[PDB]
Amino acid sequence: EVDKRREINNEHPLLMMPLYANGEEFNQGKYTFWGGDTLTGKWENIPDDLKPYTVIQLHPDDLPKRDGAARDFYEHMLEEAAKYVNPKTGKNEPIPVILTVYTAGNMPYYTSAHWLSTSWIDKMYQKYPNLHGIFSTASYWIWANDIENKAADYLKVSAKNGGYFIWAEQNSGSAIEKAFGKNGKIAFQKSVDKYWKNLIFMFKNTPAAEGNDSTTESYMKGLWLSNHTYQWGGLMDTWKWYETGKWKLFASGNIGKSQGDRQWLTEPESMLGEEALGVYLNGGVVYNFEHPAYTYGVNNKESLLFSEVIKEFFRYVIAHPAPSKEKVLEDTKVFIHGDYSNKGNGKFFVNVNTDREQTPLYMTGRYNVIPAIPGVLKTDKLKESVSSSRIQIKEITSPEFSSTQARKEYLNKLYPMNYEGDIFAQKLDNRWFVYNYKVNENVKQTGKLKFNSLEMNVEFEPHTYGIFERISNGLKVNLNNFRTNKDSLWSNAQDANQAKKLPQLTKKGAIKWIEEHYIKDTQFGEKRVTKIVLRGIDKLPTIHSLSGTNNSYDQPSLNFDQKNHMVTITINSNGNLEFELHFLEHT
Numbered sequence: 001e002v003d004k005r006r007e008i009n010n011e012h013p014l015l016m017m018p019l020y021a022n023g024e025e026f027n028q029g030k031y032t033f034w035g036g037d038t039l040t041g042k043w044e045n046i047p048d049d050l051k052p053y054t055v056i057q058l059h060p061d062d063l064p065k066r067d068g069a070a071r072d073f074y075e076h077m078l079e080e081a082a083k084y085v086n087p088k089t090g091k092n093e094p095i096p097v098i099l100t101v102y103t104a105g106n107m108p109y110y111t112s113a114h115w116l117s118t119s120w121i122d123k124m125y126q127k128y129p130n131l132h133g134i135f136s137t138a139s140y141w142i143w144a145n146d147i148e149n150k151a152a153d154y155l156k157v158s159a160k161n162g163g164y165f166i167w168a169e170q171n172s173g174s175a176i177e178k179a180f181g182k183n184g185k186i187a188f189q190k191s192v193d194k195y196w197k198n199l200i201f202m203f204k205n206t207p208a209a210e211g212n213d214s215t216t217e218s219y220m221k222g223l224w225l226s227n228h229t230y231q232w233g234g235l236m237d238t239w240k241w242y243e244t245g246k247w248k249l250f251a252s253g254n255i256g257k258s259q260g261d262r263q264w265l266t267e268p269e270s271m272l273g274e275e276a277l278g279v280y281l282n283g284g285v286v287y288n289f290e291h292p293a294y295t296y297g298v299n300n301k302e303s304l305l306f307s308e309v310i311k312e313f314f315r316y317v318i319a320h321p322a323p324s325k326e327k328v329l330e331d332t333k334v335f336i337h338g339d340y341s342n343k344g345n346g347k348f349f350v351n352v353n354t355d356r357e358q359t360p361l362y363m364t365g366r367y368n369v370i371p372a373i374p375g376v377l378k379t380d381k382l383k384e385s386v387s388s389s390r391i392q393i394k395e396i397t398s399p400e401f402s403s404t405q406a407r408k409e410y411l412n413k414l415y416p417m418n419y420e421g422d423i424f425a426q427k428l429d430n431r432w433f434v435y436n437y438k439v440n441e442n443v444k445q446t447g448k449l450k451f452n453s454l455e456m457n458v459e460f461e462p463h464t465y466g467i468f469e470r471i472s473n474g475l476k477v478n479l480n481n482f483r484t485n486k487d488s489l490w491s492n493a494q495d496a497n498q499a500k501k502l503p504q505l506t507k508k509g510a511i512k513w514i515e516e517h518y519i520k521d522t523q524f525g526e527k528r529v530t531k532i533v534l535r536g537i538d539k540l541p542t543i544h545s546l547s548g549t550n551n552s553y554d555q556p557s558l559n560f561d562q563k564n565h566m567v568t569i570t571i572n573s574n575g576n577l578e579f580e581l582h583f584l585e586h587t
C-alpha cells in the first residue's frame, strides 16, 4: 500500500467544498466559478478549525465540451492551489483538492470531463501532492457502457498514488448493484477486492421522485461494514424539491419539474441537518451538498444554511466522532444480502422506518439504518471480522422480508422499542438524537425519551432536530430549527397552477437572489416553539452556556413544579441553539 495522502474516518471526517467552473467566462479567457467564489478566497474563509477536514472539490460544470478545456481549467486551479501562501504566516500551504473526473457517463454531449484521461490523472497526482482524490458523480441516469471499467481505472490510479476515488451515486435503475457486477460488468468488483482502502462510496439523493434514499443509504453502510469501501457518506441535494415537484413551503398541489431555480432554494435549512444525521448516526463520515450557492454560499461568503446548519453540524461530528466500524458492527443485528431492485427499491422501508416513498428522512431510529449489500457481492470479509459474530446475515429473498408486515415483525424481535411517540429518535451512548420527520406538512410531533429513570418529553415542529446528552451535572442541549421564509420566491402565485407558470428565476437569477436577498436583507422565519419536559428532577434546573444564531431566540422559560419533580422548558427560536441545564435527579 502507498501511504494515504490524507485520513478519512470517524475522527477525520471530510466535508467536500464544491466549486463549479464557469464555462461562459472560460470562453472569455477567465478562470472563475459560478457564484463568484475564488479558490484562494474560499479556502481562506474556511474556519481554521475546519481546514484539516475540508477539501475543495472542483467540478467542470459547463466548460466547453471538447478536448483540452477541462485539463486547462483544472491545471490552472491546481497551480493556484499548489502555490497558495497563508498570509498570516507567509508559508506556502498547498490547498487540498479533489477533481471531478467522471459525471453524466462522461458522454461527450454532456461533459468536458470526457477529455480527462487516466494518464492525465496519474500525471496530476504525481505533480500535485495536494491532489488528494478524484470524484465520480451522477451517472445513475446515463449508465454508460464502460462505466464499471473506468471506475476500476479511477480506483487503481488513486491507490497507485495514495489518493481516494470517491463515487456518489443513487440506486436508480439498479446503479449500485450494477457497479459491483450485477449485470456481468465485474471490473470494478475486482478492483475493489484489491483497492477498497482507497474507495469512498456516497449516496446522491437528487433523484428523489424515484424514492431510492433508504435503499441506497443501506447499501452505502453495508458496503462499508463488509469492507467493500473504506468509508461512506452522502451528497444531500436541495434539488430534491424540484425532482418531487414541491413549491411554497406547506402549500398544496404539485408543480412538477417546472421551476428549478426557485425549487432548489426552498428546502428548509435545518432539513439538511436532518438528512446529515442519517450519515453520522450510521458511521458515515463524508459530506457534500448541492445546490452549492445555497448550501455553501457565494462570493467567498458563507450562506446562512452553511453558517447556522452545516458548519455547526460538521463541527459536532468532529467533536463527537461518529460510531466506528467496530461499534456499528457490534450494534448490527440484521445484515441484508441481496438486491433492493427486486424488492420494490425504496418501498422496502416504507412504513418500516420511512413514512413515504419520497423522503430523505426516517420516522424511527429503532432499527437505525439496516445495512445491506447487493446480491452480486459476498459477505466473506464481513464474517471474517471479530465484531460480526452476533449479526444475522439474511438473504433479501427471505420470508422475513417478503412484506412490510413481515419486515417489522422480524426486525422488532431483534431491535427492541426504545422510546415512545410518533417522531424520529435514535440513541447513542448518553445522547438522544431527535427530529420531526415531516417533509412538507405543518404538523408537530412528540416523543418520550429516557435516560435511565429520567424522563424527557419533547414537542417539535417540522424541520427541527435536537441532540440531548446526559452529562454528570445535567443535560447538554443542541437544537436546530433554522428555517428562513422563502415565500417571496413564490409571490404572485396563489396556487400550484399559477406557481408552475411563474417566470423562470433562472440559474443567474437564483445566484443574484442569493446575493441580494439571502446573503443580505434575509427574510428570516418566525420564531417557533419547542417544548422539553423533564420528569424526575430534584430542584429548579439552572441554565448555562446559552448561545445560538444571533437575534434568533428568546430567553428559554423554565417552569419548575416542585410537587411533581418536573420542569417544563419552553423555547421560542429559529436558528441553532445550545445550552446546558444543571440539575440532580429526584430519588
Ligand SMILES: CC(=O)N[C@@H]1[C@@H](O[C@@H]2O[C@H](CO)[C@H](O)[C@H](O[C@H]3O[C@H](CO)[C@H](O)[C@H](O)[C@H]3NC(C)=O)[C@H]2O[C@@H]2O[C@@H](C)[C@@H](O)[C@@H](O)[C@@H]2O)[C@H](O)[C@@H](CO)O[C@H]1O
Binding pocket: 020, 034, 059, 061, 062, 103, 104, 137, 138, 141, 206, 207, 239, 240, 242, 243, 290, 291, 292, 507
Ligand atoms: C438525474 C437528475 O436528477 N438530474 C439530471 C441532471 O443532474 C443534476 O440534476 C439537477 C436537477 O435535479 C440539476 O439540473 C443539476 O444541475 C444545475 O445545478 C448544478 C448545481 O447544483 C449546476 O449549477 C448545473 O450547471 C445546473 N444545470 C443547469 C442546466 O443549469 C444536475 O447536476 C449537475 O449535473 C450532474 C450530471 C452532475 O455533474 C452534478 O454534479 C451537477 O451538479 C443532469 O445534469 C441533467 C442533464 O440533462 O439530467 C438530469 O436528469
